[PDB]
Design a protein around this ligand. Structure first.
Ligand SMILES: [Ca+2]
Ligand SMILES: [Mg+2]
Length: 310
């Protein structure tokens, strides 16, 4: 059947955003990990975006039904801090998380941002490995893809360099070498790289729907039309899509997980003055390949199924 719409709302703060989907091999279930903004609280300034943990949504029926399981509450030093937009990959029997960190609970954008590396055997329990040394101390929104020579490539947003997408590389998943700016066409965030239809694709969030790029080498990018830039008809899908994660099932089947601010009015003073605008909803849509380009009709019915990985 068609996926649920919305796919999922967080039942603690209703601030589900920046979804990353990961198969839980031990419990044989699909997990979505998400930034949980404190969206249903009456808070000063931009506080609702901060003091965040990672929420867990689980499906045992291939994504037809989702249930909140709880939080991943990470620690980096002392106090109440901010955790954003985890990347999680399974590799050599372990889960590898690249999570964005903001010190304390800011009420504005006047703070550093780091990417931190945590590891887990079971997706519940995480051990701190290290802080990544990237191009600045204002870096967020890691995504990782393993290249054919075995080297892992990372993309992230550098807010200290015009909010451009940067690339880095690692052979051991711990130590990362800066490759430099990957995209210098526009400020954007939430990079997501995948392989499909014999090409590399990057999805970005330039805040007017999602950017779409293709590459033969995951270095030289060719820009295509945005997706999820027009309102959808489904419940809570009537606004631009944000910060996506792509799951490739097979050569014909790829799903895009994203979030909306369903009440809209982003980019206005009204957004910050009325907490009704703060809530976010997870969504899924099906990617298509038309005239050599990845496209998406968020309104088109499809039979959503997330099979167990064997
Ligand atoms: Ca991401
Ligand atoms: Mg992913």
């Amino acid at each position: 059947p068609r996926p649920p719409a919305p796919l999922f709302r967080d039942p603690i703060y209703d601030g589900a955003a920046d979804p990353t989907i990961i198969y839980n091999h031990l419990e044989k279930s699909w997990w979505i990990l998400y930034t949980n903004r404190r969206a249903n609280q009456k808070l000063p300034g931009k506080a609702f975006m901060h003091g965040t943990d990672i929420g867990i949504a689980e499906s045992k029926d291939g994504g037809r039904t989702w249930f909140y399981r709880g939080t991943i509450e990470l620690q980096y030093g002392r106090g109440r801090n901010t955790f954003w937009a985890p990347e999680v990959i399974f590799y050599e029997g372990e889960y590898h998380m690249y999570v964005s960190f903001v010190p304390g609970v800011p009420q504005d954008w006047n703070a550093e941002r780091y990417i931190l590396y945590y590891k887990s055997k079971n997706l519940w329990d995480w051990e701190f490995v290290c802080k990544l040394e990237l191009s600045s101390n204002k870096v967020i929104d890691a995504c990782v893809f393993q290249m054919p020579d075995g080297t892992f490539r990372m993309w992230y947003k550098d807010e200290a360099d015009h909010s451009y997408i940067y690339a880095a590389e690692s052979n051991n998943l711990k130590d990362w070498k800066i490759l430099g700016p990957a995209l210098t066409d526009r400020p954007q965030e939430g990079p997501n790289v995948f392989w499909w239809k014999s090409k590399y694709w990057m999805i970005t969030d330039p805040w007017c729907g999602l950017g779409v790029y293709s590459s033969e080498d995951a270095t030289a990018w060719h820009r295509h039309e945005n997706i999820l830039d027009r309102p959808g008809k489904r419940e809570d899908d009537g606004q631009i899509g944000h910060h996506a994660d792509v799951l490739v099932i097979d050569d014909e089947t790829a799903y895009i997980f994203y979030f909306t601010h369903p009440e809209g009015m982003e980019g206005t003073e009204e957004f910050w003055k009325d907490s009704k605008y703060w809530r976010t909803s997870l969504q899924v849509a099906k990617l298509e390949y038309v005239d050599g380009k990845v496209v998406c009709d968020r309104d088109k019915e499809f039979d959503f199924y997330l099979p167990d990985l064997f």
